[PDB]
């Protein structure tokens, strides 16, 4: 007769939603790693085969900056860091005054007061009766409070410090973030499609791909590469305010080595053997460094400036010569390698025709800190235990983190410096394609049919 | 052949209405694997839930999913459509909601843009849906007071 409403349960309808995701570890049990790896050993195993269902005809709007999956992952990484630091040994009594003197850099090395020889008039208990021990400290970890070569460890009057357990490992492993039932993860599979906007090509997944939580500051490491052309990501406004995200199509290789042959010393601090330290180096005194093929880095920088004038839209002077720093984490490429924390001078990579050329492979000097303040806000700092032997890690450089110096000078000024952006931007760099939605399966529509009969 | 979970999201409303069971299943087979706790039973007891609030946090996410299911089954219940996936009602279709004809709706539109076009009047339709039943409640009321 007339038109009547009819209830439909299970219609393909979704709305933008933020929900609680959970962790998932690859189903290897990571037996070849010897401890837990970001405490993600205890985490639901992935399905042997994931089901990815392509959605024909579907076009959905994405926003990697409004995704919040990034903020969730960020808090998850922070909390995991704290959960792994809580049970470990806190070095509260180790802030005693140190009598330290400078020791010579080698005649093959830049004469710097670096790696300081420090003696401890500190007593642990009455049993110790102010034992005198000596340890090797990188210059950055210590400050000269009073003259006559009197020293203390930095931070000790500001906050406590805790020692990373030697057993736990900082190696990032792939983590698939999964949504519960009734929610879904949407994945844009257009390779060239920029980070945000409507995606003509959408698939649905129960869990995302394997995302490695690589701690980095200047350049992104061990990420995933965009196919075909490299990708450049800013916000809508684009005018000296955001942080430029770069995703490369070809990875560059970077080898970082610490040649010093460290050892172990000053074991027992607390009841029982509780603390690791650096014995005297065996062999030559060489400073840490990283090489990057000068040819490949000049090619990659060229393709970068080509895509910069591409997204910019207007011919303009784009320089790299300068670089500016706040703190330490923006002047240096901060990252982690084997459990030691490296901080590298990138000025050779960010100058103007720096090559010639002058080296087969560009070399960057890197200093090392065992006291770091990544996610240690104001209160709890971490001491990375020393690593015995020589250190050497090979890393894929997949992305970059940049910042403009936009300035209405009629296209004259426009300078791009390697910012030391937050870690959340690293998560945005791999979450750009994913999005969380909630299913609203209830649709009502008229089909001019009525349930006359009741019961 | 079946397009898969949410496969007909870009199809016409009639085609998706044919595979609504497919979308109905992801409400249960996400939550069957988690309640199973078979692969969770032995791994470090109950996935070490002591000093790990992510474990509780994870659990709260599982709670939200079954809670949403209970919201939809409640709505199907109070509309007298619990057992069926497609049910017809007594509520007449007020034309102010949408003026589109039947052929244009079911063979030219997808459920997404339809839900977007009618999200404005969803609450009103639900009110008529909660109200209209009340006349069935009243007919049963006539049969009750004899």
């Amino acid at each position, epitope marked *: 007769e007339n038109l009547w409403v009819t209830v439909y349960y299970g219609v393909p309808v979704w709305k933008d939603a933020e929900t609680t995701l959970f962790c998932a570890s690859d189903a290897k049990a990571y037996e070849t790693k010897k401890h837990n790896v970001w405490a993600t050993h205890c985490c639901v195993p992935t399905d042997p085969n994931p089901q990815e269902i392509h959605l024909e*005809n579907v*076009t*959905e*709007e994405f926003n990697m900056w409004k995704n919040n999956m990034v903020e969730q992952m960020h808090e998850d990484i922070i909390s995991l860091w704290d959960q792994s630091l809580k049970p470990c040994v806190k070095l509260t009594p180790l802030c005693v005054t140190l009598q330290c003197t400078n020791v010579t850099n080698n005649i093959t090395d830049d004469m710097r007061g670096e790696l300081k020889n420090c003696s401890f008039n500190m007593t642990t208990e009455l049993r110790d009766k102010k034992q005198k021990v000596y340890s090797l400290f990188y210059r950055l970890d210590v400050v000269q409070i009073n003259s006559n070569k009197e020293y203390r460890l930095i931070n000790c009057n500001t906050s406590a410090i805790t020692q990373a357990c030697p057993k736990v490992s900082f190696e990032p492993i792939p983590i698939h973030y999964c949504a519960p039932a009734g929610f879904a993860i949407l994945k844009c599979k257009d390779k060239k499609f920029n980070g945000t*906007g*409507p*995606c*003509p090509n959408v698939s649905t997944v129960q869990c995302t791909h394997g995302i490695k939580p690589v701690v980095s500051t200047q350049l992104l490491l061990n990420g995933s590469l965009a196919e075909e052309e490299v990708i450049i990501r800013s916000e809508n406004i684009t005018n000296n305010a955001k942080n430029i995200l770069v995703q490369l199509n070809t990875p560059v290789q970077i080898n970082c080595t610490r040649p010093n042959n460290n050892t172990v010393k000053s074991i027992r601090i607390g009841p029982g053997q509780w603390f690791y330290y650096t014995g005297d180096i065996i062999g030559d005194i060489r400073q840490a460094h990283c090489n990057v093929s000068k040819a490949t880095w000049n090619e990659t920088l060229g393709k970068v400036v080509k895509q910069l004038r591409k997204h910019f839209g207007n011919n303009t002077i784009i320089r790299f010569a300068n670089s500016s720093g706040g703190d330490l984490e923006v002047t240096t490429h901060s990252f982690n390698c084997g459990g030691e924390f490296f901080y590298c001078n990138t000025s050779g990579l960010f100058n103007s025709t720096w090559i010639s050329g002058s080296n087969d492979s560009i070399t960057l000097p890197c200093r090392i800190k065992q006291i770091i303040n990544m996610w240690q806000r104001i209160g709890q700092a971490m001491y990375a235990p020393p690593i015995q032997g020589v250190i050497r890690c090979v890393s894929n450089i997949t992305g970059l983190i940049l910042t403009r110096d936009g300035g209405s000078t009629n296209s004259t000024t426009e300078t791009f410096r390697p910012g030391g952006g937050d870690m959340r931007d690293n998560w945005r760099s791999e979450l750009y394609k994913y999005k969380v939605v909630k299913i609203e399966p209830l649709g009502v529509a008229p089909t001019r049919c009525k349930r006359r009969v009741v019961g | 052949v079946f397009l898969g979970f949410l496969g007909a999201a870009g199809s*016409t409303m*009639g*085609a998706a209405s044919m595979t609504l069971t497919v979308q109905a299943r992801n409400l249960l087979s996400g939550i069957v694997q988690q309640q199973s706790n078979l692969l969770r039973a032995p791994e470090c007891q109950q996935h070490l839930l002591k000093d790990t609030h992510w474990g509780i946090k994870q659990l709260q996410a599982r709670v939200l999913a079954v809670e949403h299911y209970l919201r939809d089954q409640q709505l199907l219940g109070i509309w007298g459509c619990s057992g069926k996936l497609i049910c017809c009602t007594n509520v007449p279709w007020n034309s102010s909601w949408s003026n589109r004809n039947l*052929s*244009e709706i079911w*063979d*030219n*539109m*997808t459920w*997404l*843009q339809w839900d977007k076009e009618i999200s404005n009047y969803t609450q009103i339709i639900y009110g008529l849906l909660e109200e209209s039943q009340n006349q069935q409640e009243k007919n049963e009321q006539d049969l009750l007071a004899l």
Partner: nanobody
Amino acid sequence: QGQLVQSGATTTKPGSSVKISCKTSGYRFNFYHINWIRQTAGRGPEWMGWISPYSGDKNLAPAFQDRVNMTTDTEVPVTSFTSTGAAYMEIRNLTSDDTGTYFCAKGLLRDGSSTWLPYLWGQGTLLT
């Protein structure tokens, strides 16, 4: 809500091949078909053919079966339910009787019996 823009008109002497471009907007270009129709001056207008932007399947009238090549550019997404595309039409052998007005149109419904039926038309073009 959709719009169908058509290329500029041009007159070419018979014997050569030509190309008409019909640019779309205001809808999902892959959802509705694309029809090409001619209005003959002096006789009844005749439908020429249709092609799916998505499926790519093409079906032409026998009056233009081995004389017409159709192509559909991949749609460009705009909104969550709006895209833009380009439809191209070609003729192999030109003559004086080919003179007339031409139009490009979209489909009415996505499914059913009236799927490829022309609904929204372009402004039109004139020939030799």
